[PDB]
Amino acid sequence: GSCHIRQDYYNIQLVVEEKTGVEKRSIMGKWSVITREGREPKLMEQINIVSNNSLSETYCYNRLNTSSWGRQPARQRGCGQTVPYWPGDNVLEEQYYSTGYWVNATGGCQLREGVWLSRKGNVQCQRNGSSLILQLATMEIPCDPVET
Ligand SMILES: *[C@@H]1O[C@H](CO)[C@@H](O)[C@H](O)[C@H]1NC(C)=O
Ligand SMILES: *[C@@H]1O[C@H](CO)[C@@H](O)[C@H](O)[C@H]1NC(C)=O
Ligand SMILES: *[C@@H]1O[C@H](CO)[C@@H](O)[C@H](O)[C@H]1NC(C)=O
């Protein structure tokens, strides 16, 4: 994905084990939470590079299969919409875990069977105050009406 060299202002404090998803306090690891200035924190993979004619490292927002972590995210996003995670949801393009980081995930934009998170969709609803629009393929609507 998008890659960026470590800058001296980075304060890396959280590393996540790739397969187990164990979080630990550490400044250094294969997958570390990187917070670029102003940007939202992201779990990024340390990657070996050549740069200015020398061997070096960069940090890339690469895809990671979180299935083996055995723990659910707090939010997900896909196709230009960000939504609260509700149990029963499929895996979307990215997953936000509550300690505080986005993960580039292995899913798409199908939120439930036959139900896509699509900005051009035909159903408007909300989850815990957060608005979203769905495209449907009876069909259960996995969200609440906008009327209070
Ligand atoms: C996720 O990572 C893959 C490479 O593993 C990259 O091609 C893709 O663009 C990334 N997705 C996002 C949303 O950054
Ligand atoms: C992620 O790993 C799990 C097995 O633990 C399985 O769903 C599959 O191999 C992977 N999922 C995707 C979408 O690649
Ligand atoms: C969001 O709303 C649903 C139903 O209205 C509720 O079951 C769920 O607990 C709410 N989520 C949070 C984080 O409050």
Summarize the structure.
By secondary structure, the chain is an all-beta fold.
Strand content: 35-45%
How would you describe the shape?
Answer: elongated
Count of DSSP H/I helices: 0
**Helix/strand class:** mainly beta
Q: How far apart are the termini?
A: 41 Å
Radius of gyration using CA atoms only = 18 Å
Strand order of the largest sheet: 1-6-5-4
Q: Which compounds are bound in this model?
A: 2-acetamido-2-deoxy-beta-D-glucopyranose
Query: How many domain modules?
Result: 2
Q: How would you characterize the largest beta sheet? A: 4 strands, antiparallel
What is the share of helical residues? under 10%
Structure description:
The chain has 148 residues and is an all-beta fold. The protein has 2 domains: 3-60, no CATH class; 67-136, no CATH class. Helices cover 0% and strands 43% of the residues. It contains no helices and 14 strands. It has strands at residues 3-4, 14-16, 23-25, 31-34, 42-51, 54-60, 75-78, 81-84, 94-97, 101-104, 110-112, 115-117, 123-127, 130-136. Strands 1-6-5-4 form a 4-stranded antiparallel sheet, with no helix packed on it. β11 (110-112) and β12 form a beta hairpin. The chain starts with a strand and ends in a 12-residue tail after the last strand. 23% of the residues are buried. Residues 127-128, 144 line the site of one 2-acetamido-2-deoxy-beta-D-glucopyranose (NAG). Disulfide bonds join 3-60, 79-109, 125-143. Glycans are attached at residues 65, 104, 128. This is Genome polyprotein. Belongs to the pestivirus polyprotein family. It comes from Atypical porcine pestivirus 1.
